């Protein structure tokens, strides 16, 4: 917890950061629609795929925020979906990957975002929220404290970001407004503000400026520990190749990485990207992690 070259260890980069720092203040990399890596079908890949590697690979590359979209089934379990498309990945599968990673690298923590992606199957017994909280959230790995959660309290546990409305169990970040397809700012608990930029389905130029504008506001508000910044760099238009999430990501990722490298900011926020890999020139996730050198 003294050297900045400790941030270069993607598997244990949160180790050098102080316990007292709220998770909201740390610049954290994330993945959009994390569980689409198994899609091998052509027509399906062009529309729904946003990641090419598994959960463990993502975690070993510094990613700490995961975008999980689920659906309640006839068997009373929760599986991962992209619209009406079953992804061949379950919620249990994600939690078990996260558990093993937290065991191997105890200085870290993972933030899990959960959202209901499609309507429940006919024969389900209970509701989406009830099934999640009774069969999953009850596991000791989930942090059950609320408020402006700090890194020290989060180490070794999973922190929930609720994007569903049925909740009855305390823990993590609660559900808030969140209007569809746009940038906004609201309130979470009693001690926090949130600014989100999730403009999917928008022109390329409009998207790039929305990301930069939101990122500029975060740099200028580096000391506001009570403000949470969530910035999605993913774009979803009309697949059909050369218009797919892959095409877009190959330009947006190197572009935004360089933008951070030039500005030398103290804070960048939570950046949820598509296609985390080692292909594109300057690495987006790496530049986000390095923006935390000011916390050390």
- Compute the distance between CA of residue 55 and CA of residue 48 in angstroms, rounded to an integer: 17
Secondary element (H or E) of residue 69: strand 65-72
CB 3 within 8 A of CB 243: no
Give Rg (Cα) of the chain.
18
Catalytic residue from among 61, 81, 82, 227: 82
Residue 32 annotated in active site: yes
**Beta strand 85-90 with 78-82: parallel, antiparallel or unpaired?**
antiparallel
- Compute the distance between CA of residue 167 and CA of residue 70 in angstroms, rounded to an integer: 15
CA 124 to each of CA 79, 97, 121: distance values in angstroms, whole numbers, following the listed order? 13, 26, 6
Number of other CB atoms surrounding residue 261 within 10 Å? 15
Task: Output DSSP code: residue 174.
Answer: P
Tokens 């379990």 locate to: 77
Catalytic residue from among 32, 61, 81, 227: 32
Q: How many CA atoms lie within 13 A of 78 on its CB side?
A: 24
What distance separates the 2 farthest-apart alpha carbons in the chain? 55
Residue 61 annotated in active site: no
Active site (catalytic) residues: 32, 82
């Amino acid at each position: 917890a003294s050297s900045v070259n400790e941030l270069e260890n993607w598997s244990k980069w949160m180790q050098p950061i102080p316990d007292s720092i709220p998770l909201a203040r740390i610049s954290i990399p994330g993945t959009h629609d994390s569980g689409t890596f198994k899609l091998q079908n052509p027509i399906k890949q062009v529309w729904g795929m946003t990641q090419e590697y598994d959960f463990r690979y993502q975690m070993d590359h510094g990613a700490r925020i995961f975008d999980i979209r689920g659906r309640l089934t006839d068997d009373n379990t929760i599986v991962l979906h992209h619209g009406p498309l079953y992804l061949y990945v379950t919620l249990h599968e994600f939690i078990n990957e996260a558990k093993q990673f937290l065991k191997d690298n105890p200085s870290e923590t993972i933030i899990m975002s959960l959202k209901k992606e499609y309507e429940d199957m006919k024969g389900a017994e209970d509701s989406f929220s009830s099934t999640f909280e009774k069969k999953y959230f009850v596991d000791p790995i989930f942090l059950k404290t609320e408020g402006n959660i700090k890194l020290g309290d989060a180490r070794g546990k999973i922190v929930l970001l609720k994007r569903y409305s049925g909740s009855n169990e305390p823990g993590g970040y609660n559900n808030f407004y969140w209007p569809d397809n746009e940038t906004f700012t609201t309130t979470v608990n009693q001690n926090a503000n949130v600014t989100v930029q999730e403009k999917y389905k928008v022109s390329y130029d409009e998207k790039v400026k929305s990301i930069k504008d939101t990122m500029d506001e975060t740099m200028n508000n580096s000391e506001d520990l009570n403000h949470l910044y969530i910035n999605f760099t993913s774009l979803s238009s009309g697949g059909t190749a050369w218009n797919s999430p892959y095409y877009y990501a190959s330009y947006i990722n190197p572009e935004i990485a360089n933008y951070i490298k030039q500005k030398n900011p103290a804070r960048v926020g939570w950046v949820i990207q598509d296609y985390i890999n080692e292909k594109w020139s300057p690495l987006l996730y790496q530049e986000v992690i390095r923006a935390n050198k000011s916390l050390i």
